[PDB]
Design a protein around this ligand. Structure first.
Ligand SMILES: CC(C)(COP(=O)(O)OP(=O)(O)OC[C@H]1O[C@@H](n2cnc3c(N)ncnc32)[C@H](O)[C@@H]1OP(=O)(O)O)[C@@H](O)C(=O)NCCC(=O)NCCS
Ligand SMILES: CC(C)(COP(=O)(O)OP(=O)(O)OC[C@H]1O[C@@H](n2cnc3c(N)ncnc32)[C@H](O)[C@@H]1OP(=O)(O)O)[C@@H](O)C(=O)NCCC(=O)NCCS
Ligand SMILES: CC(C)(COP(=O)(O)OP(=O)(O)OC[C@H]1O[C@@H](n2cnc3c(N)ncnc32)[C@H](O)[C@@H]1OP(=O)(O)O)[C@@H](O)C(=O)NCCC(=O)NCCS
Ligand SMILES: CC(C)(COP(=O)(O)OP(=O)(O)OC[C@H]1O[C@@H](n2cnc3c(N)ncnc32)[C@H](O)[C@@H]1OP(=O)(O)O)[C@@H](O)C(=O)NCCC(=O)NCCS
Ligand SMILES: [Cl-]
Ligand SMILES: [Cl-]
Lengths: 389, 387, 387, 386
């Protein structure tokens, strides 16, 4: 069975406590569900299921994937669920939605991810009761999203471990970070993000604001980048500049069979050729994309040289340089419009976010074979091969 | 692509703030992952992926499904993820794990659910800052698990709406609840839950928990003396409604040809599954179209079923599903239901799948069905056939 | 037993979450204690006791009055304690310190008040444990400072009761608030706040705060366009009511004979004081019997007063006090009031005492009076005479 | 300038999360305000002001002293305010109420203290907002009542320094605690606390309970405890005071006022004193405070017939007794805070009740009450009957 991506859309990536500071994730997810339906000419009443990845849904209510589907007009007869594979959630949900059609259980699937790291609350177990002494209010964003559960340190420390084995210097990681900021700024100026971004209306206060530009894209320098202090180790190289940030946003895609798209006259954004997920050492979780991409290319019958465009998520400059050095693909075809260092990193949605950038760049330049991949906390990776029609 | 369930296991369903009061969900899930591996003769190094449903993972850390797999001995080369479809999470994860092997992406899958409603913390968004005035510390169990996000009332109110449309009286719902408590107690005394339950060691003295803590029985005189917990003039009480519980349940999945090569005798063959949505006001009706679509995909009729496990979230919704589908009530929840056993949201789907599989084996039933109602107006069902 | 005020000082009144957003109250109190010692030529080693009023000391540690005295250089041999009479705390502490010397128990007293409404935390009793459901994190500023403990509503509702009984229209309360804003705005430019305000160094960079941050410019047209903040059909708005503020204020007290030996010329002599209770429903009427009894103890008439400082908690309450005593409104709050300057509850009593004392010196006034209304239905007043 | 105490009363000292677990402090204060009025035959309408010490009033509402007076029947014409001198709050409020009548500003004063350490909440400053990272929920009982603001450690560590410099051994503190525990049980069994304790009606969901007995009153079971503040320390949970709830107050008027009303007073306030000491050794506070009180009264240590020295810690209590040299057989003859309890806001007035009612039954002429104060302070007051 051949499954294609009929359409795709994403919101602008908002800053931490920025444009989407008081916007729940399902509200961002509802906008993207409506957009992928409008861009493909498919009504909300035709959706069988909505599958949205989300890592931090605490305090948002019962099944935020169902809340986003309801507000987008998807009828009550359909189903909706969320899933959590950390940073690979947004891309895995696309593969999960693909399998719904491959097994014959659904026809039209809206798959992607949504995340509101700004709305992540502080929690504390209080049922037993704190009779005496102080107790900690746990940040769910740090605890459930950014801290390794086996070794106890942040995901930035894992980038320090990757920097040690590959011997990646501070100046090399800053050169990668500056390159990402300059490619993302150039892509924003030329309007290459307009096709994939759907505007979001932030209701509240006294005026309604339309958000249609990635809020982190502002540019940077090499003199101001090397003056930053390391945020994870006193003698480390990972700083706040060469590492991805905390962001809000959503991204999704409309899935259907290749024969179904031909019957509707739809021109798909690409054909899902294969996907893969593999685990690695949690100490070097940034290496996830290395075996995940290899297995994805092996299942597709492709070689590394056959790829025309690559979207490798830039969780950290240290891990991103390590993946490129091992796979050896042409770095000029990897993240041609910037990466998460400049655009942002909403964990649950980034998987579908970089899939949107991959699909719309493959369309404008005429690329035939593409690949998207991300590293996953806890020692995992996920990749997917896309081919045009 | 024929997918079988080689083995299955579950922990005892613990009471709210009971035996598993301070036990994280992944610790319960790790025991069940190790159990389904031992009962099938499959090593942890052969597992491709672990898929665990969970609704309330707040405060437990990065990806509790990966934490349960790692502690169970599953190597780092494998993958693991969690999913949330509320009450149908435990059963959907089995269907999701089945699709991993059906599409050729994996060979060995551990799929199920785990939930620790006792460890659910209180949360509050404090990044923007509370300029002035009081703010509420939100119970994540109530908000993210038991409160409808569209109408704002508890899941017990949705059972009241089902009771109005089907005209189910207070005494009729209590008779269903008392029958559920007495069937579960008889099954516990006769030892029918021992095959499916794997013991759990509560570290701290070490205590071995191998009996469902909610299974104690009840009467009709003490059941009709309870006050309604959701409406002053309502019929749903704490006795005829499911409780708050902790536990885990999973199963080992592989192809039918893979089981034949390993000499494993599977617990059953996954014939079909289905999930459908309904109105959030009457979410308990989910099992009605979900089971029908599941039977249609399997090519079966309601009369063809030999055993049925329909989760008892509420006596009102459970009576409505049986009255609508019309299946023989003597083959439905023969060993009791969630009213007596308990209702761990993330694990209940796989919990009742364990009860179905091990009862189909002891009595020799050939065609079975498991179904649950889902908050927000959904249902999920799966058809199992023996080999 | 003649007790005089040798010197006095206060910090600038900061806005809510403004310059003193992250500054504890005892840090503000230390500056005013050191300032009143420096302005009188009295060493810290001569202080017997420090009495600082404070309403919201939660989370600041053991006895913030002791923290402010020690940080101001007062040696450990001295004593320090805090007291809470709500809005009259700052002025009552001055009267309490006066009684310490009158009874022969002390010689040198630093008395005043301090309040940090921005540093007021949210609290919740959690020892028993929250089994299930949401619980409120109580804002101690609202509960312990701005909410009546007997009727449950804000102090603005009590101002509505006074406004209804006196038949005060919105435009009449609107005209008094604008007059208060215009007198305070003129005082900031004319430098009348320079003598009483001591700069405070906010220890991102050190910032010197020496101007009242709440002092804003208003008119009569933009003032009537505001919405009522306490009742949909009310008259009290955010413009005609006092604001939320931080600050500190204190004074150095000693006997008249003690000042003559040290060459200190006091700002005034404490002639009498009084405190009386009223109905909590109309707590704004407190200053009316408190000032009259204070005048009775002093042997003075209303016409004998040259300057009056009546705290402006609300425009409704402030107009009611002026109408009853009948004193010349041109000698009442000549430099503005709490509506424009601000209202740090614990410090407001000593705050308006600084404005009174330094104004009697600048214009040559002989007889002065300072009074405030107190939540829960009380009032406090003090009569000051020059030398 | 003679001020007498016409009557006095107190509630039973409750255990931490015990009988008064869900009882606000002003409710305990209301009972004692009504009790001192009934025992003296004085109407609530004659009270000028109520002065109640309290250390932990967070979450209780505007001015709990005003809340306690209003429910106790004191009319709105009176005034009420609270004050905080930590452990000396309850006794200082009596001295503050004495000064109100001495200066001619009031005639009838109800002065004492109240504390509900069980109802003390956890707090956290959240107006600025926690952008990132975990933050601590601060226990207001520990931080605002039991933690030194200058050195950052618990009040029990200050007792270790008093034990270190005075060289008080582990066995020395246990002998003082057992003597304190045995005297309090003997006084409770003999009914020696019945005159001073007023019952409190605890209303609740399942039943109303009448609390009129000290719940904390209870070497082999005593010497098996571990030190609670230092691994190499001497202060344990047995030889240190606990966390308690309760209230205590007194009715104040002039000696001529008591003679005119036919009231026979419990005693005359002769003098008082407050002095500061080193915060590191706050337990030494009562030593110069008692001497200064006796000097102003013209008395010597040998003239005292009864002494009430607060037992915050066995180490600090032993140091005061050894230096002042008063007869230990007349000090806390009915037990101390180690066995009875230590409600911070109420403890000052709590030990004043025990002194007044013991001086009356045994015929003592001159008595003394004193307590140590956190942050390096002390307070003492001399009372003599007529
Ligand atoms: C590293 C991290 C803690 C940053 O902390 P932060 O709160 O966001 O603080 P900022 O990002 O605003 O950076 C702070 C400083 O660096 C400067 N800075 C940041 N990025 C810069 C850039 N790209 N160029 C130049 N200067 C920069 C900022 O201006 C600021 O200066 P300041 O101190 O005067 O305010 C946070 O981004 C993080 O946790 N990243 C990791 C996310 C993650 O692990 N995701 C999962 C990966 S698998
Ligand atoms: C019903 C519910 C509100 C109960 O909350 P609760 O406050 O803990 O009520 P309790 O568990 O304390 O039980 C109440 C009383 O009924 C009695 N009781 C309970 N079950 C009984 C039974 N089966 N037989 C006889 N008496 C019983 C209990 O002993 C208790 O007595 P008590 O008054 O001394 O406490 C809660 O379990 C709930 O919300 N369940 C629904 C969850 C849900 O929605 N599930 C479906 C998801 S779609
Ligand atoms: C009344 C009160 C609730 C105001 O709360 P607030 O919302 O923070 O008031 P704000 O200043 O932030 O907003 C008031 C509005 O009116 C305007 N406004 C307020 N004061 C003004 C003034 N003095 N002149 C002109 N315009 C003014 C503001 O610009 C604002 O408009 P906006 O919302 O569009 O920005 C608060 O000041 C209060 O609690 N007062 C009573 C305190 C008290 O009880 N003290 C004890 C008395 S015994
Ligand atoms: C002394 C203090 C530190 C001990 O608190 P605690 O450690 O929580 O003691 P607990 O509440 O747990 O009492 C229960 C325990 O003590 C044991 N215990 C208590 N009292 C006992 C007694 N009288 N005899 C024997 N055993 C006793 C119990 O068996 C139980 O055992 P555990 O220690 O293993 O838990 C505490 O009461 C305190 O902080 N007091 C403050 C005193 C103070 O500073 N006052 C102000 C000075 S100016
Ligand atoms: Cl293995
Ligand atoms: Cl297989």
């Amino acid at each position: 069975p051949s499954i294609v991506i009929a359409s795709a859309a994403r919101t602008a990536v908002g800053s931490f406590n920025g444009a989407f500071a008081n916007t729940p994730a399902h509200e961002l997810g509802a906008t993207v569900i409506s957009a992928v339906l409008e861009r493909a000419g498919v009504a909300a009443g035709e959706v069988n299921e909505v599958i949205l990845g989300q890592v931090l849904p605490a305090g948002e209510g019962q099944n935020p994937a169902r809340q986003a589907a309801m507000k987008a007009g998807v009828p009550q007869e359909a189903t909706a669920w969320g899933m959590n594979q950390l940073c690979g959630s947004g891309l895995r949900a696309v593969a999960l939605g693909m399998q719904q059609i491959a097994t014959g259980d659904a026809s039209i699937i809206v798959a992607g991810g949504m995340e509101s790291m700004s709305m992540a609350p502080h929690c504390a177990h209080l049922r037993g009761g704190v009779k005496m002494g102080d107790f900690k209010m746990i940040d769910t964003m740090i605890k459930d999203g950014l801290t390794d559960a086996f070794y106890g340190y942040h995901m930035g420390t894992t980038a320090e471990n990757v920097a040690k084995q590959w011997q990646l210097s501070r100046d090399e990681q800053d050169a990668f970070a500056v390159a990402s900021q300059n490619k993302a700024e150039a892509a924003q100026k030329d309007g290459r993000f307009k096709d994939e971004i759907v505007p979001f209306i932030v209701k509240g206060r006294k005026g309604d604001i339309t958000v249609d530009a990635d809020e982190e894209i502002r540019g940077a320098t090499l003199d101001s980048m090397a003056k930053l202090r390391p945020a994870f180790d006193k003698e480390g190289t990972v700083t706040a500049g060469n590492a991805s940030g905390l962001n809000d946003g959503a991204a999704a895609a409309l899935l259907m069979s290749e024969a179904e798209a031909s019957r509707r006259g739809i021109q798909p954004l690409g054909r899902i050729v294969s996907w893969a997920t593999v685990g690695v050492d949690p100490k070097v979780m940034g290496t996830g994309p290395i075996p995940a991409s290899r297995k994805a290319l092996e299942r597709a019958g492709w070689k590394i040289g056959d790829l025309d465009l690559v979207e490798a998520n830039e969780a950290f400059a240290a891990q991103a340089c390590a993946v490129n050095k091992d796979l050896g693909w042409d770095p000029s075809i990897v993240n041609v419009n910037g990466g998460a260092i400049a655009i942002g990193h909403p964990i649950g949605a980034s998987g579908a976010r970089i899939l949107n950038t991959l699909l719309f760049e493959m369309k404008r330049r005429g690329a035939r074979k593409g690949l998207a991949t991300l590293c996953i906390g806890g020692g995992m990776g996920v990749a997917m091969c896309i081919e045009s029609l």
